[PDB]
Structures are given as C-alpha cells and as structure tokens.
Design a protein around this ligand. Structure first.
Ligand SMILES: *[C@H]1O[C@H](CO)[C@@H](O[C@@H]2O[C@H](CO)[C@@H](O)[C@H](O)[C@H]2NC(C)=O)[C@H](O)[C@H]1NC(C)=O
Ligand SMILES: CC(=O)N[C@@H]1[C@@H](O)[C@H](O)[C@@H](CO)O[C@H]1O
Ligand SMILES: CC(=O)N[C@@H]1[C@@H](O)[C@H](O)[C@@H](CO)O[C@H]1O
Ligand SMILES: CC(=O)N[C@@H]1[C@@H](O)[C@H](O)[C@@H](CO)O[C@H]1O
Ligand SMILES: *[C@@H]1O[C@H](CO)[C@@H](O)[C@H](O)[C@H]1NC(C)=O
Ligand SMILES: *[C@@H]1O[C@H](CO)[C@@H](O)[C@H](O)[C@H]1NC(C)=O
Lengths: 413, 410
C-alpha cells in the first residue's frame, strides 16, 4: 500500500479533530486530469498568489524574490495532519485548503496523496521534496501521525536536542536539507535560530533540475542594459533565440511567455509588463483567476526571445508573515494544540529557494551551440525582450501546479 | 588491363594534339585542387546570374569530367582553353595527355572502392551518328580512361528518338533521378556526337536524424508569401566553427567519414553574397581545418531540390570560346577522316539533391553536344534565407556536389 494506491481509508485522522469548510456559493477541467488534483492545486495556487503579494509589499521593488509555495503548502500541510480545533481551523483557512468546497481536513491529505504521487514520480526534469518538521527529543510523537506523515508527505517527525545540542541541531538540520537538495540549498536555518527555547521548527524546500526543451545558444548571449525598478540601469547577460513558444499578449500589453523544459510537463512562465507599466501594478492586480485565465489562452507562436541569465537564492522566516496573514494559534505556546504529537507549538518556519537560469536551463551550463539551417521567419513577428523586471513561475502543467514563483527585478551582477 | 593500377609509362594514351604549359598521388591531388578551383570559380559565375534567393545545385566533378573527355578529341587553341578553364594547366607536367591519366586515377580512387556504405558511382558514354566513322584512337582511348563506349544513333533522321534515347541512359545510371539531361530540339540532323557523364551518390547519416523529432514549419519566401517546410532536429557532437562575420560552418559526415556534407550559413543579418564572392579552394580549406568537434543542436530541413541549366554562357565567360565557335572549334581527333567542322553546339547539366533523416541522395549528369541546336532552358523554385552545401570526399579533396539551398519547401 503506497502513495499511488492510497484510498481515503488509508489516510485516517482523529475525529473531534476535523474541520468542515463551507460550500462555495466554473470548471476549466481538461482531459484525463484527476479532479481532486485539480481542486487542490487551485487552492495551493490561491495561497501561492496571496502569500506572494504580501511578501512583495514587505520588500523593495528592486529586490529579487523566489520561493516555492508548493513547498510551504506541503510543509504546513504535513504539520496540519496533527492539528486540531482552533489551531486547525486556521491552517485550513490560511492555506486556502478550506476553499475546496465542503471537503474536510481529512480529505485534503488524500488529495496531497494523489498530487504527491504524480508530482515526484520520476530521465530529465527531476523534482525532489525536502520537507521535514523538527521538535525536541522529548514527549509523545504519536506514531499514527508519522506512519502517515510518511505515506503522504514522505518524511518522519525527527526529534532533536534543543538544550545540550541546540547548536549541533541547527547543523543536523542544515546538513540534512543541503544533502537532499544535491547541495543547492545550504544554510537552511539561519544563524542564532536554534537554542533551548526552540520547541518546534519547520523546514521546507524543493529541488528542480531540467533542460530547456529549446536551448538558447551561448554564441548568442550579449551584455545588455536592464532597466530597474528605480530609474537606473545595469549590465546583464541577455540570452537570445527564436522559435515556437506558447505566448499571449494580455491586459495593457503585458507579455506572457512559456519556455518549456525537456518533457514539457514542467515549464517556466515569464510575465513581463509593458515599459510604461510597473511590475507593481501587475503584481497587485495578479489574482489566482486572472493568472489562471492568462495561461489558458496561450497559443503556440513564432517569436524572438530576449531573456537575461540570472541566479536567485532566498531565505525566509515564514512565521511573522504567516501570522500577519491569520495563522497564529500554531505559533503561540499557550494557544497551540497539536494532539498529533505538553505546551507544544512552532518556534519558527524556515524556507530556502534556489534558481539559476542559463542557456541550457537549470542544470549546469555547457557550450551546446545551435545551428538552424533552412529557416526564414516573418519579418513582422512578435518580440519578447525582458530587459526590465518580470515575474517567474515554474509550473507542472498536467497537475496545474505552481511549483516555484519569483521576481527577477535585478539580474545583473 | 586495369586502367587503375597502371603506371604512367604503361598507359599508351597518345592523343592527336599535345599542349605545352609556359609524383602521381601528388599529381592526383593537384588535379583535385585544379578541379576544386574550377568548381568555385564556375559556381560564382553561376551565382552572378541568379537572384540571391535562387536555388542552385550541381556536380562540378561531373562537369570537369565530361569536358576532360571532350578534351581528348580537342585540338589547337581549343585544347588550350579547355586546359585553362578547367585549370588542368595548374597540374605538374606541361603535357595535356598526362592529365587524362591522373583524372582516371582519381576516378579509380573515387568510384572504385571495396564498398563503404556510401555508394558513389560514375558512368560515361559517347553517342555518335549512325552514318559516321569515328577515329579509332579516340574511341579506344575515350573508353580506356573513362570507360566511355561509343554507341550509335540516327541523328540525321531520328534526332528526337535519339535525345529520348540518351536521356534515358542517364535516367538509368542515376536511379531515375536525372531524367532529362538533354532538353528537346538540342539534337538535330547535323548532330555529330554527344559526350555524357553521370555521377550518383547516396550515403547514410553517420549520426541519423529522428523522423519523430521532425516538425512542419512555415517558411517565408523573399517575396512575402510563405510555404510549409519540415525541419529535422538532433543534438550531438559535430565538427563546427563559428567564424568570419559570424558565419557557421557545419560538417555532417556519412557512414564512412570519407564523404561529408558541409553546410555554411552566414549570420542571420548578413547574406551569402559576400561569402560566395570570397569562396576559393583555400578559403573552404581554411574553414575545414578550424572545424573542432563540438556539442551542439542541429536543425536541418528534410527536403529535395533539382536543378538544370546550360554551361554555354558561363563556360564562355570563363574563357572557353573556341570549342563553342562553329569556326574556331578544333576537334580533329573524333571523325576519322579528320573532319573539321565539329564544334560544341551546347552543353547541358542536370543535378539532384535530397536530404532526409537517413541521409541524402545526390545525382548529376553533364551532356556535351557536338553540332546540335544551340537553344537558356527552364526555371528554378525560389525562397529566402539560403545556405551553401558541398558533398565532398575528404581523403581525396574533391567537391562532388555543391550548391545553394534556398527553398526547402516540398
Ligand atoms: C497518540 O495518542 C493517541 C491517543 O489519542 C494513541 O491512540 C491510541 O492507540 C491505542 C493503541 O493503538 C488504542 O488502544 C487507543 O484507543 C488509541 N486512542 C484512541 C482513543 O483512538 C496513539 O497510540 C498515540 N501514539 C503513540 C505515541 O503511542
Ligand atoms: C543524510 C542522508 O540521508 N544521506 C543521503 C542519503 O540518504 C541519500 O540516499 C543520498 C542520495 O544520493 O544523499 C545522501
Ligand atoms: C597527329 C597524329 O595523327 N598522330 C599520329 C601520327 O603522329 C602518326 O604518324 C600516325 C601513324 O599511325 O598515327 C597518328
Ligand atoms: C592553326 C594550326 O592548325 N596550326 C598548327 C599546325 O601548324 C601544327 O602542325 C599542328 C600540330 O598540333 O597544330 C596546329
Ligand atoms: C476541541 O478542543 C478541546 C479543548 O479546547 C478538546 O478537548 C477537544 O478534543 C477538541 N475537539 C472537540 C470536537 O471538542
Ligand atoms: C585518329 O586519331 C589519332 C589521334 O586522335 C591519330 O593518331 C590518327 O592519325 C587518326 N587516324 C584516323 C583514324 O583518322
């Protein structure tokens, strides 16, 4: 009985410890696409967009960004497995799982079961989950929890010594993650983050590696000025190439470009607004249904792509924002209530996201040059030149899931 | 006896007229350079007459051959001009006849091999009138160095059943690819002889393409119209070299490594024009040396193009006049009695190329016509963003085929 065969009966949860979300007062549903995976992903996306807009304000327009809502959601989802009462009512409400009409907190875990099966299930374009919870090596760690936090989210409890080993912990951890993420994510937990008062700490991240299905050519990269959020400009390494790429021009000339990865199931979506418009307006106006709609109308088209190479690493302390967003009873010592594992609450949540884009894709560079003989394209054709701030997305199409999302507001070095 | 293994002193070849200019394998190599030089020169003269978006294809090897043959019965002045325009004079010895021997050695090292997957053959043939008497020295030697036999045909009354007669022989020696070397009305009652050459190629891609990864795609002609193509695609290690003003030189070897196709596309902005205008055997060689193996993506159209035309015009512009003159033409070694009103009415050429996922198939034929009609022929099939193509034999340094692919559209 594994993740890909689980039926609701294989994912039980303590009664008198359940939530019932309200009825939603239509359905782009494509071909053979499991509706439950579809519904869940819409909620993950609702959270992905919301969380992102709040994280945008708390940052400068010139700051880059990059996280993994899929990460954070599957994380706090794992934790939520043992939530209950007013604590749980908040995990649902805040991660929009409560927006999947009528669906009960116990079902949510069966959906993730379904999504997770299809998500991380293996040539190229590998996706890996690095989520795990950390609490003191003390009291009850209800086995039933783990037994499932193994089947569904694939990673057990894991108690540490927040006392005699409060330091070789914030290293036992950083060592774990940085191992799974094949060395990409290193300093998972910041400095002076773990001590004795540290009760529980949540750590989440993802590892995506893949090649552009239509690689750019090194021989074509050329330094170019990138106009930033302020007014200035700088030296960025602009990549160049042409070919069929799903595209679409939308509201007030904002460009939406899809570059796929080998496999086609994992793609990168760029959202570049016209020069006169600010990424700000776009970021704020970007709602789950607007974004969802935009992607729905992408048509294959021949065009000229100009996109800068860029690297982006980022660390987060989910706690403050999460709180500010409504999630609190989990971060409070007296208000907590996780009967799945007393006074046990979350001391902090840390996330690290990493993305480096070159002429080949995500994986290590190379020199693969491109030779296209016998091709003549229309002189009048679309042109997508990203020499100004744009959004980024790495989604899994068939599962309509936003894996990573970010903002490249300064690619230069 | 074997015309191949033979040595210089063994071959009896003792023509009618010898020309005097002002190490065998070292000479065969010098012939190839002579030929290669004729190929680029000739090619430019052929470009400098078409729209820079016009398709072009030919086998300069096929041409250099048919005329090497004609050179046999050639004499005084015409014998020299032939020695010049085909740069046979740039060969070691200052003795015409010597050439013919080296050319046969080359044809041995080319079409005569113990197999190699890459099929590469040649067939030659003379076609004389039913009522004439051909000089026996010519006929024996024509069939000695080129394996060119002399078959009869009624040119005096059945000029037409004759063309059809000849065209088919090529159609047979070129897998039905070249089926119309000689046009219509080009051979009449006064038609004396007709020298013909044919070369056929067909190799498999060493690194085959995938029919799966091929995609139909719109291609825009220079005009403004567009037609569907079919690009193939594959990633792999290849000899390549971004050079010049961003020109790309790519080599695509066939099963054997002895015969390779070299593509040459100029920077998207620029055009072939300045590339063609500078093409020479050394240039093309310079590039061939820089080619370092490299990991790279290859996008190539799965197409086929045919091309036909007359060698008269250009061959004249290049200095070959006498042979075409009903007066100055001197070909006394052909019609026994020593007849001397034999001149080349016209020379026709017809080539064929087809590139697909398995490999390519090239065929060409050249027909020299002595005293027939001297009629420009039919047109091509234009498009845009063109690129050069050469199918060459590397160990032998000879351009078998070459051209400018412009319109791949089917
Ligand atoms: C975590 O706590 C629960 C109690 O809520 C434990 O569940 C009990 O398990 C035993 C043995 O399977 C049963 O006899 C009880 O009936 C269960 N409780 C109820 C009311 O269902 C669970 O075993 C605990 N986990 C650990 C660490 O043992
Ligand atoms: C700390 C730890 O578990 N070590 C991991 C090992 O489990 C895993 O199999 C391997 C992947 O190659 O990377 C390392
Ligand atoms: C110019 C010419 O015709 N070549 C030879 C000639 O030298 C020779 O005397 C004659 C006798 O067979 O044969 C022929
Ligand atoms: C114009 C002309 O016919 N003159 C010469 C003739 O003097 C010579 O004997 C012959 C030998 O090749 O070549 C010719
Ligand atoms: C709700 O919380 C109370 C304590 O506040 C706890 O005893 C109970 O099990 C929880 N669930 C229900 C349905 O009462
Ligand atoms: C035939 O031509 C050869 C040289 O081409 C010459 O030796 C001979 O004199 C000629 N004899 C005839 C058949 O007229």
């Amino acid at each position: 009985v594994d993740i890909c065969t689980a039926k609701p009966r294989d994912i039980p949860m303590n009664p008198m410890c359940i939530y019932r979300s309200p009825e939603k007062k239509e359905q782009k549903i494509p071909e053979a696409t499991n509706r439950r995976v579809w519904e869940l992903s819409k909620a993950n996306s609702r959270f992905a967009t919301t969380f992102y807009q709040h994280l945008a304000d708390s940052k400068n327009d010139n700051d880059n960004i990059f996280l993994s809502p899929l990460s954070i959601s599957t994380a706090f989802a794992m934790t939520k497995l043992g939530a209950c009462n007013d604590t749980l009512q908040q995990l649902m409400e805040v991660f929009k799982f409560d927006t999947i009409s009528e669906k009960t907190s116990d079902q949510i875990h069966f959906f993730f079961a379904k999504l997770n099966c299809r998500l991380y299930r293996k040539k190229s374009s590998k996706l890996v989950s690095a989520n795990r919870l950390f609490g003191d090596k003390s009291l009850t760690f209800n086995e039933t929890y783990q037994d499932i936090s193994e089947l569904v989210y694939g990673a057990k409890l894991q108690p540490l010594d927040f006392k005699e080993n409060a330091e070789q912990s914030r290293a036992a951890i950083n060592k774990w993650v940085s191992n799974k993420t094949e060395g990409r994510i290193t300093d998972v937990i910041p400095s002076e983050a773990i001590n004795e008062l540290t009760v529980l700490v949540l750590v989440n991240t993802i590892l995506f590696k893949g090649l552009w299905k239509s690689k750019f050519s090194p021989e074509n990269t050329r330094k170019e000025l990138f106009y930033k959020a302020d007014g200035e400009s700088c030296s960025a390494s602009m990549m160049y190439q042409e070919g069929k790429f799903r595209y679409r021009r939308v509201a007030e000339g904002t460009q939406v470009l899809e570059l796929p990865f080998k496999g086609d199931d994992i793609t990168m979506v760029l959202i570049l607004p016209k020069p006169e418009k600010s990424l700000a307006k776009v970021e704020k106006e970007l709602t789950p249904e607007v974004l969802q709609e935009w992607l729905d109308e992408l048509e294959e088209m021949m065009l000229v792509v100009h996109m800068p190479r860029f690297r982006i690493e980022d660390g987060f302390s989910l706690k403050e924002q999460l709180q500010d967003m409504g999630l609190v009873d989990l971060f409070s010592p007296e208000k907590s209530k996780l009967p799945g594992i007393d006074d046990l609450y979350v001391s902090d949540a840390f996330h690290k996201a990493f993305l480096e884009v070159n002429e080949e894709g995500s994986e290590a560079a190379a020199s693969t040059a491109v030779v296209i003989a016998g091709r003549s394209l229309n002189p009048n054709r679309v042109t997508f030149k990203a020499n100004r701030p744009f959004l980024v997305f790495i989604r899994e199409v068939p599962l309509n899931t936003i894996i990573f999302m970010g903002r490249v507001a300064n690619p230069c070095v």
